[PDB]
Design a protein around this ligand. Structure first.
Ligand SMILES: NC(=O)C1=CN([C@@H]2O[C@H](COP(=O)(O)OP(=O)(O)OC[C@H]3O[C@@H](n4cnc5c(N)ncnc54)[C@H](OP(=O)(O)O)[C@@H]3O)[C@@H](O)[C@H]2O)C=CC1
Ligand SMILES: COc1cc(C(C)(C)C#Cc2c(C)nc(N)nc2N)cc(OC)c1OC
Length: 192
């Protein structure tokens, strides 16, 4: 796969864009999790799949029984990994481009975490889309948070809902979804 168009997918708490605390997620938003599954899994052309790419720490955060994430090609990046195809669902590499050089029959490519990987790849020109779940809370400062996005969104344009709807197909997009004290919306951004 040569020069794939790549999408970042992430859920972040406004306005600071916090995404984690002590190696874990600061919320459990069940509908958001299902959205993540549906969007990363679904394909538009028959007999293909998507790839999901992540840093080693993010991979290790998934319970070992629930990785690899089913129905998607999982790619894990470490600075200690040489290129290795582990099995049909798992690749080890040290860059996204090299990891996908090894790959055919993949439609979409998603970056699924974590902060370090996000904050590098936001400035990689292969990344053409951001799928950001913007989470809001009445008192965001009260949520324990130590990992943050550093996204220069001035160089990006938030697209209308119609563009997001097109991207996700017939996936149902509900507005202002509320779980506990959190309220969230699905968004799509492209390069300005
Ligand atoms: N809210 C959300 O939507 C999401 C939040 N998260 C959160 O993010 C946090 C994890 O993020 P973070 O701790 O930054 O870790 P990452 O998941 O981003 O992994 C970092 C590791 O990836 C490898 N790596 C980083 N850059 C490169 C590179 N350029 N080339 C090759 N390998 C590289 C290194 O592995 P090595 O050390 O082996 O060399 C590094 O230690 C957790 O708290 C998690 O819950 C994660 C996903 C989504
Ligand atoms: C697939 O579910 C998980 C996803 C994840 C990761 C970190 C890969 C994620 C994510 C993610 C979500 C939930 N939403 C959005 N919008 N983007 C993401 N990258 C970690 C998990 O355990 C900690 C999970 O439970 C098994």
């Amino acid at each position: 796969m040569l020069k794939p168009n790549v999408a970042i997918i992430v859920a972040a708490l406004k306005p600071a864009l916090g995404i984690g605390y002590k190696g874990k997620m600061p919320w459990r938003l069940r509908k958001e999790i299902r959205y993540f599954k549906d969007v990363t899994t679904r394909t538009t052309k028959p007999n293909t799949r998507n790839a999901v790419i992540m840093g080693r720490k993010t991979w290790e955060s998934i319970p070992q029984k629930f990785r690899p994430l089913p129905d998607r090609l999982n790619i894990i990046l470490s600075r200690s990994y040489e290129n290795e195809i582990i099995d049909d669902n798992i690749i080890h590499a040290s860059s996204i481009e090299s990891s996908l050089n090894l790959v055919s029959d993949v439609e979409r490519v998603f970056i699924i975490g974590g902060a370090e990987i996000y904050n590098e790849l936001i400035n990689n020109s292969l990344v053409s889309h951001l799928l950001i779940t913007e989470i809001e809370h009445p008192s965001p400062e009260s949520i324990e948070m130590d990992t943050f996005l550093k996204f220069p969104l001035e160089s990006w344009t938030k697209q209308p809902k119609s563009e997001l709807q097109k991207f996700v197909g017939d996936t149902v997009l509900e507005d202002d979804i509320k779980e506990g004290d959190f309220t969230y919306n699905y968004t799509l951004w492209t390069r300005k």
